[PDB]
Design a binder for this molecule. Sequence first.
Ligand SMILES: CC(=O)N[C@H]1[C@H](O[C@@H]2[C@@H](O)[C@@H](O)O[C@H](CO)[C@@H]2O)O[C@H](CO)[C@@H](O)[C@@H]1O[C@@H]1O[C@H](CO)[C@H](O)[C@H](O)[C@H]1O[C@@H]1O[C@@H](C)[C@@H](O)[C@@H](O)[C@@H]1O
Ligand SMILES: CC(=O)N[C@@H]1[C@@H](O[C@@H]2O[C@H](CO)[C@H](O)[C@H](O)[C@H]2O[C@@H]2O[C@@H](C)[C@@H](O)[C@@H](O)[C@@H]2O)[C@H](O)[C@@H](CO)O[C@H]1O
Ligand SMILES: CC(=O)N[C@@H]1[C@@H](O[C@@H]2O[C@H](CO)[C@H](O)[C@H](O)[C@H]2O[C@@H]2O[C@@H](C)[C@@H](O)[C@@H](O)[C@@H]2O)[C@H](O)[C@@H](CO)O[C@H]1O
Ligand SMILES: CC(=O)N[C@@H]1[C@@H](O[C@@H]2O[C@H](CO)[C@H](O)[C@H](O)[C@H]2O[C@@H]2O[C@@H](C)[C@@H](O)[C@@H](O)[C@@H]2O)[C@H](O)[C@@H](CO)O[C@H]1O
Ligand SMILES: CC(=O)N[C@@H]1[C@@H](O[C@@H]2O[C@H](CO)[C@H](O)[C@H](O)[C@H]2O[C@@H]2O[C@@H](C)[C@@H](O)[C@@H](O)[C@@H]2O)[C@H](O)[C@@H](CO)O[C@H]1O
Ligand SMILES: C[C@@H]1O[C@@H](O[C@@H]2[C@@H](O)[C@@H](O)[C@@H](CO)O[C@H]2O)[C@@H](O)[C@H](O)[C@@H]1O
Lengths: 87, 87, 87
Amino acid sequence: MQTAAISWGTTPSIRVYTANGNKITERCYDGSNWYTGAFNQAGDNVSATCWLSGSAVHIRVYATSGGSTTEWCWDGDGWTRGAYTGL
Amino acid sequence: MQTAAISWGTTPSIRVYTANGNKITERCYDGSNWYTGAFNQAGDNVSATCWLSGSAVHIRVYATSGGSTTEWCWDGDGWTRGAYTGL
Amino acid sequence: MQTAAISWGTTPSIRVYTANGNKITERCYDGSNWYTGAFNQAGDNVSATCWLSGSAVHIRVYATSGGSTTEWCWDGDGWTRGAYTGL
Ligand SMILES: CC(=O)N[C@H]1[C@H](O[C@@H]2[C@@H](O)[C@@H](O)O[C@H](CO)[C@@H]2O)O[C@H](CO)[C@@H](O)[C@@H]1O[C@@H]1O[C@H](CO)[C@H](O)[C@H](O)[C@H]1O[C@@H]1O[C@@H](C)[C@@H](O)[C@@H](O)[C@@H]1O
Ligand SMILES: CC(=O)N[C@@H]1[C@@H](O[C@@H]2O[C@H](CO)[C@H](O)[C@H](O)[C@H]2O[C@@H]2O[C@@H](C)[C@@H](O)[C@@H](O)[C@@H]2O)[C@H](O)[C@@H](CO)O[C@H]1O
Ligand SMILES: CC(=O)N[C@@H]1[C@@H](O[C@@H]2O[C@H](CO)[C@H](O)[C@H](O)[C@H]2O[C@@H]2O[C@@H](C)[C@@H](O)[C@@H](O)[C@@H]2O)[C@H](O)[C@@H](CO)O[C@H]1O
Ligand SMILES: CC(=O)N[C@@H]1[C@@H](O[C@@H]2O[C@H](CO)[C@H](O)[C@H](O)[C@H]2O[C@@H]2O[C@@H](C)[C@@H](O)[C@@H](O)[C@@H]2O)[C@H](O)[C@@H](CO)O[C@H]1O
Ligand SMILES: CC(=O)N[C@@H]1[C@@H](O[C@@H]2O[C@H](CO)[C@H](O)[C@H](O)[C@H]2O[C@@H]2O[C@@H](C)[C@@H](O)[C@@H](O)[C@@H]2O)[C@H](O)[C@@H](CO)O[C@H]1O
Ligand SMILES: C[C@@H]1O[C@@H](O[C@@H]2[C@@H](O)[C@@H](O)[C@@H](CO)O[C@H]2O)[C@@H](O)[C@H](O)[C@@H]1O
């Protein structure tokens, strides 16, 4: 069981990604009860980062399953695969 | 051994959490030399995030031991157990 | 395999550090294609953080091999070894 944590804004919002049992899930704080978010992808290891633009939060989550890392992107309109490729 | 690193401000301040065995400890930098910080909790994995607000630094450390993640909170007055629960 | 991710600026720039076996490498995004970065050091675990000073982006990468964590620093002019020592 392994986590990654990000936050933004002054509320703040927090996201905690947990890799366990080959899956990565997402717990979210937006100022009230913690909740389970829409992020759900395969992986045994996770990292994440985020930034703000004028009218969106952008999240990049790096999900590693074995020898391959997949980037997952939030830009306000659902989770989409990113263009990241490894070395 | 596994680490998590955060930073804030212009100086900057940096905090590095290290899980070794089932203990997490904290090394700190505030602009001079590194020192050992007040954080000390159980865990074999760690992540962390931080933000500035309200004339304070807020840090959240997510410490996983025994299949369970505990959130530990610094808001200027000691490390306190947070509301976070997992999936 | 295990990763750490950081980001800055509006573009944004992203760096993803991957520990595979006992080597840490870096992939970079600055608004067009991903490319392989200058960072290359020993380690079985990586974390990272960054900040903007007025005049440059600063990155700190914490590379652990065994019971020892080394800090590597980017301050605009190559990677240098940081003062960080462990507990
Ligand atoms: C109260 C507090 O958190 N003090 C730390 C201080 O925080 C500042 C905020 O209060 C605020 O003014 O914003 C600025 C940044 O704009 C600071 O974040 O920051 C200084 C460094 O500039 C720290 O040295 C202070 O650290 C705490 O100091 C108190 C003094 O009573 C105690 O010694 C604490 O043990 C010490 O905490 C250390 O830092 C905190 C953030 C945790 O990592 C602790 O585990 C660690 O020991
Ligand atoms: C569009 C957007 O990014 N909205 C953010 C809010 O979170 C999403 O809200 C939509 C409805 O507008 C849904 O409820 C959605 O499930 C929420 O997504 C959650 O947060 C995002 C960032 C991801 O982490 C996702 O996996 C997760 O479920 C959010 O409540 C507020 C907080 O201020 O920000 C909005 O921008
Ligand atoms: C939102 C925030 O940062 N608030 C800080 C306080 O933490 C919250 O305090 C209330 C009671 O007043 C509840 O205990 C709540 O659970 C606390 O939330 C904590 O922080 C948020 C961001 C999440 O990480 C959550 O899981 C965690 O429990 C804190 O007590 C005061 C102390 O001065 O500072 C506030 O800024
Ligand atoms: C500071 C910064 O973001 N620079 C970006 C350029 O990156 C550096 O470019 C120089 C040539 O001018 C060198 O190729 C150097 O290796 C590049 O450094 C890269 O970024 C820094 C922050 C580290 O991560 C380092 O290991 C990595 O190689 C970049 O080439 C250009 C165009 O993509 O954009 C600049 O933002
Ligand atoms: C005075 C100061 O803060 N200097 C920063 C430069 O790095 C530090 O330089 C001093 C001078 O003795 C020490 O060598 C110090 O250990 C250096 O710190 C480095 O960076 C900090 C943030 C930590 O990561 C530390 O472990 C690391 O060694 C630094 O080169 C410049 C960057 O342009 O910033 C100076 O403020
Ligand atoms: C920050 C990057 O986000 C995505 O890349 C975006 C592209 O998919 C595309 O939307 C162009 C404009 O059309 O903008 C890019 O920023 C990811 O694919 C990429 O890996 C970065 O995370």
